DNA sequence: GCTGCGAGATCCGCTCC
DNA sequence: GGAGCGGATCTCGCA
């Protein structure tokens, strides 16, 4: 947690990893490895619950497309209209059974209105409109309504339905297809949630903001007493800060450390 | 372990289906529009893409007894059984879980202005603001058993694994010849613990004069 | 033990260095010429000459800053920091030995002609004259903190007894787990001191959270 | 119609006092 | 259990 993360931050500078990346490799919390992606100078100049919506049609039946950037994880469900109202119930019955923060869609009637935005407010997951401009998008986005409306004419015949069809879909693509060891897609977001939950015990204790003292060891010198640093993150008896002058993270025992009032 | 259950309601002239877990708790909504069986053919294969039961039970209805969802039923695989449950358990749990939602559903009726919205809405309260035992939700503690069962379904491959390994004695201030090939006991940094078959001995030997091997036929 | 702080003051335009103890609480104050780096590290041997400091705590100066200065404290071979102490102890200490001493030297300041023997007289009848609780001058404790300070004392440390033992940590009476084995300190009466790893922290464990390891047979 | 060799160090395994 | 002791084993360099 706390002493690996120089290590970390080292790597990424020598490889320019992501932070999913790091997360997987280093075990150090998501929101360390979002801060270290970030804060790269070269990569300022993929993720987990980031999903893209867009818009296909099949038999002349409105059908929505949720595609999951890093899980790979595809879902689908029957809307009756493009209008406003029904495009909210599926986007928040969406959040149903989901706990995303990052969303992406293009401009659409249905996509921009004057209830639209503050009903998305209320849920507080951040969401960003824009033109898929890249390449990489074009051609990602191409093959995914390739692979979910082959599925389709597989298993029509024995189904009674269209909507029948559309949890078939679900079960060839979610269920079935899996790679590495086994690993289904569904597999892979069960477990991303299991790692995703263990930074809200951290976090629950550490909202709220202190200043405190650090001193630097030397051959068992102590030196003397510097500061103030901000406080990073929390751990068993190690704590992190931020070096003014060498510009690198420092891990310092709970024994060299004092609590300085507001 | 992986049971669910079916209830119906009936409120303001409306059907609301209920998908009912009894290990964990899991609690699904959705509005039924009519009683013909293909709504239920949908909802039942819906349930089976967003998620992976092992045994279902339910009482009986209409459109259940029919030749055509028993075969799609036995086609997708899950299991049924008729009859009414004689479990007050799962009793219980079914009225005390209708008549929370049906006050919470009740409860939450100024807030929302349509109708299948207010019916998402409401899944969203039940699902998320129900915390059990440490404070946990019904679709945390259904994937914390998953990931449970996952990992004492794979734990088995951490333990396949008896290598083999040859070994080397310094006899006079000279190494010997390359002894083996046997099956390592315990490997520990630094050195690793064999079985001699000359002395019927243990002996420790480094990592310096070792070589490895899978194992034979 | 053997807490030392080194200060400046000022009187009648004249520079003072003065040294505050904590354990034996005997103030020592000498005149300096100059506040220069030369001059402070011959009145930090003069000040070595009779006696043998341990910790020294100082404050902010040009003077204690210095390549030469820190290679001459390297050459003392003493533990010794030098920055800006926040302390509250350590500021109020230093203050009130500041007014004490200011308001005792002007007594004796008329029938003493030379300011040195004025403060070395003023000195002597505070530590000759000053007693607290039975009788104790602070020179007392200097000698009690300087006798305690034997080399033969150390290695007499063991004669026979060691043991080991678990504990268990209690939280509104719900206790925690035996934390594995630990080195015991030593033995009173219901309760026992431990050393924790984790935070390197001496606890104390009541007999009854105790498990007593049984000596070899 | 024929050809490698041993001196000088070092331990093991032994038995005997 | 201490004790020395006979012998198998090792490399290297004559040309
Ligand atoms: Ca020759
Ligand atoms: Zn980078």
């Not at 080292?10 to 490799?25: F, G, I, P, R």
């Not at 051609?139 to 339905?161: G, S, W, Y």
């Not at 899996?178 to 892979?188: H, N, Q, R, V």
Request: charged share 25%.
């Amino acid at each position: 947690w706390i002493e690996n993360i120089p290590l970390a931050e080292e790597e990424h500078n020598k490889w320019h990893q992501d932070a999913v990346s790091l997360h997987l490799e280093f075990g150090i919390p998501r929101t360390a490895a979002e801060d270290i992606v970030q804060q790269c100078d070269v990569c300022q100049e993929r993720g987990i619950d980031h999903w893209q919506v867009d818009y296909t049609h099949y038999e002349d039946k409105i059908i929505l497309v949720w595609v999951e950037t890093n899980s790979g994880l595809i879902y689908a469900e029957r809307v009756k209209g493009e209008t406003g109202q029904e495009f909210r119930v599926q986007t928040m019955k969406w959040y149903a059974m989901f706990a995303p923060k990052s969303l992406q869609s293009d401009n659409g009637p249905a996509f921009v209105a004057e209830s639209t935005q503050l009903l998305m407010k209320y849920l507080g997951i951040e969401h960003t409109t824009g033109i898929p401009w890249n390449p990489q998008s074009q051609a990602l986005v191409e093959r995914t309504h390739q692979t979910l409306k082959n599925t389709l004419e597989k298993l029509i015949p024995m189904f009674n339905a269209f909507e029948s069809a559309l949890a078939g879909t679900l079960i060839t693509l979610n269920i079935k297809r899996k790679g590495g060891l086994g690993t289904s897609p569904m597999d892979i977001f069960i477990f991303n949630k299991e790692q995703q939950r263990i930074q809200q015990q951290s976090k629950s204790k550490q909202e709220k903001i202190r200043f405190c003292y650090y001193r630097t060891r030397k051959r068992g010198h102590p030196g003397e007493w510097q500061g103030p640093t901000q406080v990073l993150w929390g751990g068993d008896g190690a704590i992190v800060v931020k070096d003014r002058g060498t510009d690198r993270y420092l891990v310092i025992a709970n024994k060299d450390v004092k609590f300085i009032p507001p």
